[PDB]
Amino acid sequence: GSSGSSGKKPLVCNECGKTFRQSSCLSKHQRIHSGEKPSGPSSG
Ligand SMILES: [Zn+2]
């Protein structure tokens, strides 16, 4: 009875490694590591 194993991957901060439940949560948290938005040759 294979469930499916399609996806449904959790949302974790690739910066620290903290998993979250909501999408806005993780993101609103990532801002802590990443300052302004990625413009270009400025940040990276
Ligand atoms: Zn983080």
The 3-state secondary structure of the chain reads CCCCCCCCCCEECCCCCCEECCHHHHHHHHCCCCCCCCCCCCCC
Is 42 inside any structural domain?
yes
Å from CA of 26 to ligand 1 middle: 8
Is 28 inside any structural domain?
yes
Cβ within 8 Å of residue 16, ≥6 positions away: 33
Structure tokens at 22: 């909501």
Is 3 inside any structural domain?
no
Q: Domain span at residue 25? A: 10-44
Tokens 């499916």, residue?
4
Is 1 inside any structural domain?
no
Å from CA of 1 to ligand 1 middle: 37
Long-range contacts, stretch 5-9, CB < 8 angstroms, 24+ apart: none
The number of distinct structural domains making up the chain is 1
Contact between residue 26 and residue 13 where contact means Cβ atoms under 8 Å apart: yes
Rounded CA gap, 31 and 44, in Å? 16
Is 5 inside any structural domain?
no
Contact between residue 20 and residue 9 where contact means Cβ atoms under 8 Å apart: no
Å from CA of 4 to ligand 1 middle: 30
Contact between residue 13 and residue 30 where contact means Cβ atoms under 8 Å apart: yes
Å from CA of 2 to ligand 1 middle: 34
* CATH number of 15's domain: 3.30.160.60
Burial string for 13-28 (b: 16+ CB within 10 Å, else e) reads beeeeeebeeeeebee
